[PDB]
Amino acid sequence: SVKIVHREFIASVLPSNDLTVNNGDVNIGKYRVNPSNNALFTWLQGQAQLYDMYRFTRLRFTYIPTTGSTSTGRVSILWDRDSQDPLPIDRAAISSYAHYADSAPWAENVLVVPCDNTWRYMNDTNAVDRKLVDFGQFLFATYSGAGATAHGDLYVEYAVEFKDPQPIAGMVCMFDRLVSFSEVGSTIKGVNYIADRDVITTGGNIGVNINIPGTYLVTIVLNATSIGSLTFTGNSKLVGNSLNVTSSGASALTFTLNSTGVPNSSNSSFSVGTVVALTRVRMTITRCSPETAYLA
Amino acid sequence: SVKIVHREFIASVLPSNDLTVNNGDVNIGKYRVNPSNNALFTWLQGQAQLYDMYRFTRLRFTYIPTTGSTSTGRVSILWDRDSQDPLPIDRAAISSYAHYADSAPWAENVLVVPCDNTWRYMNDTNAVDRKLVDFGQFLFATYSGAGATAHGDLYVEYAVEFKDPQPIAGMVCMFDRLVSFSEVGSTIKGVNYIADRDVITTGGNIGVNINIPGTYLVTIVLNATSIGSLTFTGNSKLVGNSLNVTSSGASALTFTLNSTGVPNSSNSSFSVGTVVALTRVRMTITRCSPETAYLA
Amino acid sequence: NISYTEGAKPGAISAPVAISRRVAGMKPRFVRSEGSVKIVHREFIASVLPSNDLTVNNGDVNIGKYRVNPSNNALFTWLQGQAQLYDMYRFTRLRFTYIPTTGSTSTGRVSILWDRDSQDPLPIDRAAISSYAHYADSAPWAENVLVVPCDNTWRYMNDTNAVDRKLVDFGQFLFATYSGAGATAHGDLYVEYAVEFKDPQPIAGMVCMFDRLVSFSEVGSTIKGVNYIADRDVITTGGNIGVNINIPGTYLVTIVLNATSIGSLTFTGNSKLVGNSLNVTSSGASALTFTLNSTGVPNSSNSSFSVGTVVALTRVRMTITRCSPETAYLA
Amino acid sequence: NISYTEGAKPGAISAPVAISRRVAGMKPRFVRSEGSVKIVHREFIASVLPSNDLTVNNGDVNIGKYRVNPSNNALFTWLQGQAQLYDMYRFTRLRFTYIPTTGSTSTGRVSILWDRDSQDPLPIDRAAISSYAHYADSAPWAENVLVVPCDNTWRYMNDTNAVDRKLVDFGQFLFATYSGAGATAHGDLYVEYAVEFKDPQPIAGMVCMFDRLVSFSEVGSTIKGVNYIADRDVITTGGNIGVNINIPGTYLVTIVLNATSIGSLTFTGNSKLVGNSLNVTSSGASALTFTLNSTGVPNSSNSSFSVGTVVALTRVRMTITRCSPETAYLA
Amino acid sequence: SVKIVHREFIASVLPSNDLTVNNGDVNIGKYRVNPSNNALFTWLQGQAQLYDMYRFTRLRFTYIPTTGSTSTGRVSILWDRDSQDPLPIDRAAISSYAHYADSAPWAENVLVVPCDNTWRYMNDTNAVDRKLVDFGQFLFATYSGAGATAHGDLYVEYAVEFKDPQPIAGMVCMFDRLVSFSEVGSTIKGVNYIADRDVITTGGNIGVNINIPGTYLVTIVLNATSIGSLTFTGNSKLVGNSLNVTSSGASALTFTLNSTGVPNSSNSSFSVGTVVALTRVRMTITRCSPETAYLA
Amino acid sequence: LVDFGQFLFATYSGAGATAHGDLYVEYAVEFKDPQPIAGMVCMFDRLVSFSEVGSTIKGVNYIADRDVITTGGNIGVNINIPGTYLVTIVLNATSIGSLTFTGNSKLVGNSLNVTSSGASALTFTLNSTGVPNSSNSSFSVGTVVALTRVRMTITRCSPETAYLA
Ligand SMILES: [Ca+2]
Ligand SMILES: [Ca+2]
Ligand SMILES: [Ca+2]
Ligand SMILES: [Ca+2]
Ligand SMILES: [Ca+2]
Ligand SMILES: [Ca+2]
Ligand SMILES: [Ca+2]
């Protein structure tokens, strides 16, 4: 048994007047506590890919403000033992989790989750009853805030044991959408950096949203008559140079970007514009360091 | 502090009549014992990337035959505590080393290295005096043999301590050659899947050799008027679909392959043929699993 | 008898032309248990076929083919029968044994592996097969053994087709091989076990039922009962239907096709028809029943049985049952 | 593990396909001595190459190639370094060990011999090789050993090129072979020794200096320092110069030729150039420096390095030093 | 952690000559032992809704006659640890089970189930492999009997642990059928008071069967040109006043009823007659007390 | 990180031609791991066309960069460690003048010189007292034209191995 201790950043809490959970993302179990869930474990996943089974020994969630002391609102950090339970919508519900922590947006907060003795399977083999392979799910909620200045950040801190060395699961994610067939839906394999809704292919534009902090290598291949410009207008900056190959019928772009992880609903992490007759999107995303950025 | 134990495959030993060290690879650190060195630690690097320092507690190299009893010659396994020392050139020199073992190609063999108490740094890629950051270097040799079929496989088994969680070093390798300047030399960053001599760029051909066993994701962007065919006639097989975009002046290919790791001097891991006026090669290689292969 | 080897000084190693070990039948032992019964027994699995490129499980692409569950007859030819009768099981001792059946002249690697997660994908590269915690590697002409340390979790025999198999299986056995040559196998694989059964129950059933709405998609299906086949084993495309029973033994098949017309029933791969095949074709629907013997070794291009020249295939419903050849249809 | 051999009654002999023995590194032991130090150690010598006709020392014609003297790196790759430091030596234990590296299918004779006179000519016939007092014969696929009983005479390391070597060497090791076939070696030769060193001294020097007045004769020379080459190893005839370094390892060479003109420097035999070769040609004199790696196995027709198309060769002066490849010249 | 002990009524056993399991209900999980399952835990569900996980410590099923000594046949009580296993079809199969008991209809009987140490999840309604979230299933059977008057009543007595307070799952059931699409099938959410087959929607009638004993509050909204009468000719009686609003195109009825729980194949718990062009049925059922009945 | 510090000695307010006294080192030293002989050769390489200063030095450290002077039509090599050394020096330069031994070293036996247009080579073995000299190198090459490159090889050795006349 291999014993790992670490702390890592998850996501920033955006202000909201009405009660919103997980910055408005409606996916149940988005932050399921399974080390292969890169949306929660931005760092652990790198080590998780090498082992079959995991057991948390200590687990705590912290909230640290980045806003001023006159910001209004509630930040609630929560853990639900069942990673398949629906997201709460009401103010009674979010306060009723056994494992809760509440604070003003300008106050630090901590949530300790008492761990159990059960080993669980790490590997994502698209388990259907996820609750049986996750140690619950983390979630956050917020209300009574105003503006777009993020309140603060969320971190996870833990002790985990890992059990069986195995062939590496990898840090690659690949996305495939047949736009011919529909502008929504896709096949996604490997690491869950993006879900379906994170890739927008409509009205002559492609937006991809990497809403998990980090530096990533992307290579995207478009089946399209022609494409316009690659732009970085949202949560990510291009790191080093972007390699672009355009032809009639297909094009390919590769580059390393640096994402904040903070979701932007009007501007994607990167977009490609003026795309004519888009048939297919095939793409590969991989968490990495900035050292492997392409050169000028 | 974080204690890892594992056994992993290194390389298959090709037969040779004349003495051949490290399957003919000439480079001095090839198998420096440092967890970053993916040529030696085919599996461990995936964990090494997350930590600052290491210390080996137990370390042994194993040889298991894959050849027949009628195969002639010997396979030598060898450890030098100075990772910068030159490779030995004649068989007698091998016997001068304190830590070596030598056997028939048809016999299992083992070499136990006595470990010390000193911590050393995970990244050695900046470092100049690499002996101070490596726990020596492993070498293998063979002589008095014949045939194309490999004698047997080498493995490393160890118990190692890692010390400090860090930002991930990443599992990607970035290669860059300005072929217009010269058909040799390059900037390589990230993990050492390849070295300069592994990318052949001449006579209207491009061949790249991934002589480290595993499954990889690659993206090559080519600055060239036109290119011909992508072929896999060496130690690697295409996994899933290859995505190829060709234009006048530039081409991009992206695909995941499965390498046997064993070097082939006639056929590269992948080749691209009939290449006209190659000015620049920029490429990205990342160890992964086959689950993220591109679809047809 | 031991012989002296010519030209060896004391303590030398030698390679003989071939190594072997006699295997003898041993009736199962029945032992004291927390549950109903503990069985200590030993069963033959398969023979490792040679291949140059790395292949796992003699080329069977089905994940978890040798999942460790008493109801899986791919791993337990006899224990399957015993599994029928109980609800839950626990392995107490588990080991896999390799006996070479080839001379010391044969090249290659034979790897015997166990993956704690029975739903994990099959490995394809040399780094992967070497990286399993529970591994055992040898030349194909050498003996080998892999001991899997058991836990004390009870699991259900999956007789209700659990979707997350990993939670009902005790991992999966798998074997891999590379750099081999020739037509004949390298050696034989055995499983040796001690297994407890918990709760007596009505017989689970020996039948497998497969149902695909081809009109919806040429891929995907509902499979209930014993898992003799997986989805990918039934090919329905391009005017052909191919069914791959890649587990050895004798099977009764009834296949009912919703399709305008069908051509010939062929047995052109790993199976042979036993006795007579009963075929009824009409406009819009066809039915075939027959019993076959399958070697269970997977074939890329020729299914266990195929139905050719099939027109507007809308639906496949089929029933597959392990049985005796005695029960074959008459001429 | 010991196995039973099929079809043998008790006390039979068997031939396996191949015999081997693991060799492991063992650091030298240092022991009490009448002199400064006694070293107990073990070194690899060479691999016996197969030949149909009787050949000694893998075809090296140099008498006393494996003369027993610590300063002879043809026999002691490591002890040479140690010899540098002392005046005199005495071998206490000496044995030569043969490990086969070929199958029991291989034909031939391997003879390991020791001749008390290190200047005696090499034998060429089967009667001769069999007639040495200190001999050991085997099939090439069998293990063998030759124990040389030592005396207690101290000798000088010959670091001043003694002309009557026999009086400074403890005889010569040599090996012979015949009726073999194929490209690959029969087996490996090791020396195992206990040796005393007497008198500490300034390092003897690692350099060999060769000088031939070709204008006097195409044969003969002055050689001072380490004996990496003998006279016959430097060929100067017919517009060619060939230098044969028939002892393995890495060597720095500087060769200065008194000759009107020279052609190409070629590496066409047992050696490879390391890094860059530095060549300076003028009318009447040429100079080349480079460092090479030599396999040390003698070649009849292709020297370690050659200089072609050389005109009116008057003089060869050359310097050869065993060294590290690290020290090669840059491009 | 929270330790509950209770005894509660499950169902009355109707006589039958042929073998009849679970009073003729065909569904495989009917009495899965999971505190959410209100068909088995008529009382406990009201608490189960507030917690994430359960573990039974003691568990026994009791049968107390309500019939006469001259009633023929037998009543079988039965526990399968696999809650997904099919119902037995013949009497001999019942005897194959390890945990069953069988007696005269006029005799008290008990079946003690030995509990295990494993915690399982309270919600099983998402879960696919329900055996992993249920502690088996209870079944009852009867045969060799006759008459309309029930043989006796079944009860469950247990000591159970609950683990984590959560947002309430609620005590309401929501039923929805698009009858214009089909007269069968439906979306049912919340507590399992009813299953699809319990709402009959055909021949100008609507019947709904609440075959779980208790008092309920219902609201049915009907999409239909016109409706006739609300009747209570089955296992339920109106409590207080029924509130009926009829219009052209839509109707709403709301009332609280008192169900005996015993199924009736001729008369539903409540029926609405002479229903013209029913397109849609949407309904809400909530266990409650009679104190909240509507007034005249 | 590979040395156990450095010995050094200093002196002042002395007079006369003769030495003050002698320095000895007395030690007990352990050696760990047997290996193939490291090599006795030093290889020096300077791209003079790049800069008159800096170099690549591999092998035994008999000289440091500053010990090889390449400036103003002169090359000076200072072997400031005592003993006997084999030297081969190959100069990329249009022409060169005389080889002089005018400082701390003496030529042993004969010096072998080969000059051509664009390249020169010298081999010889010297004895050096190793005492540093400010103005006169161990050996010098004079009147050198368009010096582009110095590649040289220096090896501690025996005087027995000197070249013959
Ligand atoms: Ca919850
Ligand atoms: Ca695994
Ligand atoms: Ca069952
Ligand atoms: Ca059952
Ligand atoms: Ca001497
Ligand atoms: Ca002396
Ligand atoms: Ca060394």
mmCIF file of N, CA and C in Angstrom, chain F residues 88-165:
data_model
loop_
_atom_site.group_PDB
_atom_site.id
_atom_site.type_symbol
_atom_site.label_atom_id
_atom_site.label_comp_id
_atom_site.label_asym_id
_atom_site.label_seq_id
_atom_site.Cartn_x
_atom_site.Cartn_y
_atom_site.Cartn_z
ATOM 1 N N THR F 88 50.462 16.145 -28.216
ATOM 2 C CA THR F 88 50.212 16.307 -29.652
ATOM 3 C C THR F 88 49.344 17.531 -29.794
ATOM 4 N N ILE F 89 49.830 18.535 -30.519
ATOM 5 C CA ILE F 89 49.061 19.757 -30.716
ATOM 6 C C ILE F 89 48.809 19.983 -32.206
ATOM 7 N N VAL F 90 47.547 20.161 -32.563
ATOM 8 C CA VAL F 90 47.172 20.363 -33.953
ATOM 9 C C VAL F 90 46.522 21.731 -34.097
ATOM 10 N N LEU F 91 47.158 22.589 -34.893
ATOM 11 C CA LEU F 91 46.734 23.972 -35.074
ATOM 12 C C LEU F 91 46.075 24.207 -36.431
ATOM 13 N N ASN F 92 44.863 24.755 -36.412
ATOM 14 C CA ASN F 92 44.251 25.294 -37.622
ATOM 15 C C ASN F 92 44.674 26.750 -37.776
ATOM 16 N N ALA F 93 45.653 26.963 -38.650
ATOM 17 C CA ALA F 93 46.242 28.278 -38.877
ATOM 18 C C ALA F 93 47.019 28.234 -40.167
ATOM 19 N N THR F 94 47.030 29.366 -40.865
ATOM 20 C CA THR F 94 47.686 29.496 -42.158
ATOM 21 C C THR F 94 49.163 29.108 -42.102
ATOM 22 N N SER F 95 49.895 29.669 -41.152
ATOM 23 C CA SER F 95 51.312 29.346 -41.013
ATOM 24 C C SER F 95 51.735 29.450 -39.546
ATOM 25 N N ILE F 96 52.824 28.776 -39.184
ATOM 26 C CA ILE F 96 53.382 28.911 -37.841
ATOM 27 C C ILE F 96 54.901 29.051 -37.894
ATOM 28 N N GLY F 97 55.482 29.604 -36.839
ATOM 29 C CA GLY F 97 56.927 29.746 -36.778
ATOM 30 C C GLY F 97 57.593 28.639 -35.991
ATOM 31 N N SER F 98 58.456 29.034 -35.054
ATOM 32 C CA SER F 98 59.250 28.100 -34.254
ATOM 33 C C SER F 98 58.527 27.569 -33.017
ATOM 34 N N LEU F 99 58.828 26.315 -32.669
ATOM 35 C CA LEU F 99 58.441 25.712 -31.385
ATOM 36 C C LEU F 99 59.565 25.986 -30.401
ATOM 37 N N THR F 100 59.283 26.720 -29.332
ATOM 38 C CA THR F 100 60.332 27.036 -28.363
ATOM 39 C C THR F 100 60.048 26.473 -26.977
ATOM 40 N N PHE F 101 61.109 26.086 -26.278
ATOM 41 C CA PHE F 101 60.988 25.603 -24.911
ATOM 42 C C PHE F 101 61.778 26.528 -23.997
ATOM 43 N N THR F 102 61.093 27.554 -23.512
ATOM 44 C CA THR F 102 61.778 28.735 -23.030
ATOM 45 C C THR F 102 61.402 29.087 -21.584
ATOM 46 N N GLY F 103 60.577 28.221 -20.980
ATOM 47 C CA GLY F 103 60.081 28.388 -19.617
ATOM 48 C C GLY F 103 60.370 27.212 -18.700
ATOM 49 N N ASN F 104 59.330 26.648 -18.081
ATOM 50 C CA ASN F 104 59.505 25.602 -17.068
ATOM 51 C C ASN F 104 59.720 24.166 -17.566
ATOM 52 N N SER F 105 59.819 23.984 -18.883
ATOM 53 C CA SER F 105 59.922 22.636 -19.437
ATOM 54 C C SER F 105 61.102 22.444 -20.375
ATOM 55 N N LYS F 106 61.556 21.194 -20.482
ATOM 56 C CA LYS F 106 62.581 20.823 -21.450
ATOM 57 C C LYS F 106 62.064 19.760 -22.382
ATOM 58 N N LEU F 107 62.399 19.891 -23.654
ATOM 59 C CA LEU F 107 62.060 18.877 -24.628
ATOM 60 C C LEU F 107 62.843 17.601 -24.346
ATOM 61 N N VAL F 108 62.190 16.462 -24.479
ATOM 62 C CA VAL F 108 62.857 15.185 -24.296
ATOM 63 C C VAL F 108 62.956 14.502 -25.649
ATOM 64 N N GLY F 109 64.183 14.151 -26.026
ATOM 65 C CA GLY F 109 64.435 13.566 -27.331
ATOM 66 C C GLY F 109 64.003 14.533 -28.416
ATOM 67 N N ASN F 110 63.393 13.996 -29.460
ATOM 68 C CA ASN F 110 63.091 14.795 -30.623
ATOM 69 C C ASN F 110 61.653 15.248 -30.695
ATOM 70 N N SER F 111 61.477 16.436 -31.249
ATOM 71 C CA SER F 111 60.181 17.039 -31.460
ATOM 72 C C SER F 111 59.772 16.860 -32.921
ATOM 73 N N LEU F 112 58.573 16.343 -33.158
ATOM 74 C CA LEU F 112 58.125 16.047 -34.519
ATOM 75 C C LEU F 112 57.131 17.082 -35.042
ATOM 76 N N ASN F 113 57.529 17.820 -36.073
ATOM 77 C CA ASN F 113 56.766 18.975 -36.550
ATOM 78 C C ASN F 113 56.369 18.818 -37.995
ATOM 79 N N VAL F 114 55.093 19.035 -38.279
ATOM 80 C CA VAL F 114 54.585 18.972 -39.641
ATOM 81 C C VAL F 114 53.741 20.212 -39.890
ATOM 82 N N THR F 115 54.187 21.050 -40.826
ATOM 83 C CA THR F 115 53.491 22.301 -41.160
ATOM 84 C C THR F 115 52.972 22.249 -42.584
ATOM 85 N N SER F 116 51.749 22.723 -42.783
ATOM 86 C CA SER F 116 51.179 22.879 -44.124
ATOM 87 C C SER F 116 50.439 24.212 -44.217
ATOM 88 N N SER F 117 49.930 24.532 -45.394
ATOM 89 C CA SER F 117 49.144 25.736 -45.521
ATOM 90 C C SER F 117 47.790 25.470 -44.892
ATOM 91 N N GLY F 118 47.497 26.147 -43.786
ATOM 92 C CA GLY F 118 46.185 26.036 -43.148
ATOM 93 C C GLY F 118 46.122 25.141 -41.914
ATOM 94 N N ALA F 119 47.134 24.288 -41.738
ATOM 95 C CA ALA F 119 47.165 23.343 -40.615
ATOM 96 C C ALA F 119 48.578 22.881 -40.248
ATOM 97 N N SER F 120 48.853 22.835 -38.950
ATOM 98 C CA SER F 120 50.129 22.340 -38.447
ATOM 99 C C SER F 120 49.927 21.336 -37.321
ATOM 100 N N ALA F 121 50.879 20.419 -37.168
ATOM 101 C CA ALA F 121 50.836 19.440 -36.078
ATOM 102 C C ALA F 121 52.211 19.270 -35.453
ATOM 103 N N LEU F 122 52.263 19.254 -34.124
ATOM 104 C CA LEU F 122 53.507 18.991 -33.390
ATOM 105 C C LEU F 122 53.296 17.903 -32.341
ATOM 106 N N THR F 123 54.222 16.944 -32.272
ATOM 107 C CA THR F 123 54.252 15.974 -31.171
ATOM 108 C C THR F 123 55.623 15.911 -30.580
ATOM 109 N N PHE F 124 55.667 15.795 -29.261
ATOM 110 C CA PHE F 124 56.912 15.743 -28.507
ATOM 111 C C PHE F 124 56.544 15.389 -27.074
ATOM 112 N N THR F 125 57.526 14.958 -26.290
ATOM 113 C CA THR F 125 57.280 14.764 -24.876
ATOM 114 C C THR F 125 58.234 15.669 -24.095
ATOM 115 N N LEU F 126 57.722 16.326 -23.056
ATOM 116 C CA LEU F 126 58.529 17.257 -22.259
ATOM 117 C C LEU F 126 58.596 16.885 -20.782
ATOM 118 N N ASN F 127 59.609 17.407 -20.092
ATOM 119 C CA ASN F 127 59.657 17.349 -18.631
ATOM 120 C C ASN F 127 59.374 18.738 -18.106
ATOM 121 N N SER F 128 58.433 18.848 -17.174
ATOM 122 C CA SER F 128 58.088 20.155 -16.626
ATOM 123 C C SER F 128 58.413 20.194 -15.156
ATOM 124 N N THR F 129 58.953 21.317 -14.692
ATOM 125 C CA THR F 129 59.229 21.497 -13.265
ATOM 126 C C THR F 129 57.916 21.859 -12.600
ATOM 127 N N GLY F 130 56.978 22.298 -13.429
ATOM 128 C CA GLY F 130 55.638 22.598 -12.984
ATOM 129 C C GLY F 130 55.526 23.922 -12.272
ATOM 130 N N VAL F 131 56.647 24.616 -12.052
ATOM 131 C CA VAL F 131 56.560 25.926 -11.400
ATOM 132 C C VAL F 131 56.132 26.955 -12.418
ATOM 133 N N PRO F 132 55.045 27.674 -12.116
ATOM 134 C CA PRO F 132 54.484 28.614 -13.105
ATOM 135 C C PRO F 132 55.415 29.766 -13.466
ATOM 136 N N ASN F 133 55.394 30.138 -14.746
ATOM 137 C CA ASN F 133 56.140 31.267 -15.275
ATOM 138 C C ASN F 133 55.207 32.274 -15.960
ATOM 139 N N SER F 134 55.268 33.525 -15.510
ATOM 140 C CA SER F 134 54.459 34.633 -16.044
ATOM 141 C C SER F 134 54.629 34.927 -17.532
ATOM 142 N N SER F 135 55.870 34.863 -18.011
ATOM 143 C CA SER F 135 56.217 35.378 -19.341
ATOM 144 C C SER F 135 56.723 34.336 -20.352
ATOM 145 N N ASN F 136 57.018 33.135 -19.878
ATOM 146 C CA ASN F 136 57.547 32.092 -20.742
ATOM 147 C C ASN F 136 56.813 30.786 -20.494
ATOM 148 N N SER F 137 56.014 30.369 -21.468
ATOM 149 C CA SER F 137 55.243 29.143 -21.340
ATOM 150 C C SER F 137 56.111 27.877 -21.368
ATOM 151 N N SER F 138 55.524 26.762 -20.930
ATOM 152 C CA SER F 138 56.164 25.448 -20.934
ATOM 153 C C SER F 138 56.702 25.174 -22.321
ATOM 154 N N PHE F 139 55.826 25.325 -23.317
ATOM 155 C CA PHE F 139 56.224 25.440 -24.728
ATOM 156 C C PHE F 139 55.408 26.507 -25.450
ATOM 157 N N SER F 140 56.018 27.146 -26.444
ATOM 158 C CA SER F 140 55.343 28.179 -27.225
ATOM 159 C C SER F 140 55.471 27.899 -28.714
ATOM 160 N N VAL F 141 54.486 28.362 -29.479
ATOM 161 C CA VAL F 141 54.609 28.388 -30.921
ATOM 162 C C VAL F 141 54.516 29.837 -31.357
ATOM 163 N N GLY F 142 55.563 30.291 -32.040
ATOM 164 C CA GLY F 142 55.716 31.695 -32.408
ATOM 165 C C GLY F 142 55.223 32.032 -33.797
ATOM 166 N N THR F 143 55.060 33.331 -34.052
ATOM 167 C CA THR F 143 54.712 33.845 -35.387
ATOM 168 C C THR F 143 53.634 32.974 -36.071
ATOM 169 N N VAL F 144 52.482 32.867 -35.415
ATOM 170 C CA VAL F 144 51.375 32.079 -35.965
ATOM 171 C C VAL F 144 50.307 32.969 -36.606
ATOM 172 N N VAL F 145 49.886 32.592 -37.812
ATOM 173 C CA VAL F 145 49.024 33.440 -38.634
ATOM 174 C C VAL F 145 47.600 32.907 -38.777
ATOM 175 N N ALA F 146 46.624 33.762 -38.471
ATOM 176 C CA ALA F 146 45.189 33.438 -38.580
ATOM 177 C C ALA F 146 44.876 32.134 -37.869
ATOM 178 N N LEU F 147 45.139 32.132 -36.563
ATOM 179 C CA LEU F 147 44.891 30.968 -35.738
ATOM 180 C C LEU F 147 43.402 30.836 -35.504
ATOM 181 N N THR F 148 42.860 29.710 -35.950
ATOM 182 C CA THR F 148 41.422 29.454 -35.942
ATOM 183 C C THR F 148 41.011 28.468 -34.861
ATOM 184 N N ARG F 149 41.892 27.507 -34.605
ATOM 185 C CA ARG F 149 41.581 26.395 -33.734
ATOM 186 C C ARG F 149 42.829 25.730 -33.136
ATOM 187 N N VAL F 150 42.746 25.398 -31.846
ATOM 188 C CA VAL F 150 43.744 24.577 -31.170
ATOM 189 C C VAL F 150 43.045 23.322 -30.642
ATOM 190 N N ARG F 151 43.516 22.167 -31.094
ATOM 191 C CA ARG F 151 43.139 20.892 -30.489
ATOM 192 C C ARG F 151 44.416 20.231 -30.056
ATOM 193 N N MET F 152 44.440 19.790 -28.806
ATOM 194 C CA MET F 152 45.650 19.249 -28.228
ATOM 195 C C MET F 152 45.359 18.101 -27.280
ATOM 196 N N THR F 153 46.350 17.236 -27.146
ATOM 197 C CA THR F 153 46.231 16.069 -26.325
ATOM 198 C C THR F 153 47.471 16.046 -25.419
ATOM 199 N N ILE F 154 47.263 15.957 -24.106
ATOM 200 C CA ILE F 154 48.371 15.917 -23.137
ATOM 201 C C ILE F 154 48.253 14.695 -22.215
ATOM 202 N N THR F 155 49.327 13.916 -22.102
ATOM 203 C CA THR F 155 49.295 12.688 -21.314
ATOM 204 C C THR F 155 50.530 12.575 -20.448
ATOM 205 N N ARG F 156 50.341 12.397 -19.143
ATOM 206 C CA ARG F 156 51.458 12.114 -18.248
ATOM 207 C C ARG F 156 52.061 10.778 -18.634
ATOM 208 N N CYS F 157 53.382 10.721 -18.710
ATOM 209 C CA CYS F 157 54.054 9.517 -19.170
ATOM 210 C C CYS F 157 55.498 9.390 -18.677
ATOM 211 N N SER F 158 56.215 8.447 -19.280
ATOM 212 C CA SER F 158 57.620 8.188 -18.988
ATOM 213 C C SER F 158 58.458 8.894 -20.034
ATOM 214 N N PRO F 159 59.624 9.442 -19.643
ATOM 215 C CA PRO F 159 60.546 9.952 -20.656
ATOM 216 C C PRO F 159 61.062 8.874 -21.631
ATOM 217 N N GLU F 160 60.936 7.603 -21.265
ATOM 218 C CA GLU F 160 61.448 6.512 -22.094
ATOM 219 C C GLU F 160 60.800 6.467 -23.477
ATOM 220 N N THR F 161 59.669 7.140 -23.574
ATOM 221 C CA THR F 161 58.752 7.006 -24.678
ATOM 222 C C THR F 161 58.908 8.191 -25.657
ATOM 223 N N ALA F 162 59.897 9.046 -25.375
ATOM 224 C CA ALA F 162 60.227 10.200 -26.215
ATOM 225 C C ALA F 162 60.543 9.769 -27.644
ATOM 226 N N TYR F 163 60.353 10.674 -28.594
ATOM 227 C CA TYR F 163 60.646 10.372 -29.985
ATOM 228 C C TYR F 163 62.139 10.397 -30.285
ATOM 229 N N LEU F 164 62.550 9.576 -31.242
ATOM 230 C CA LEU F 164 63.951 9.477 -31.621
ATOM 231 C C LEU F 164 64.360 10.446 -32.744
ATOM 232 N N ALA F 165 65.645 10.817 -32.775
ATOM 233 C CA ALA F 165 66.198 11.770 -33.766
ATOM 234 C C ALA F 165 66.049 11.343 -35.238
#
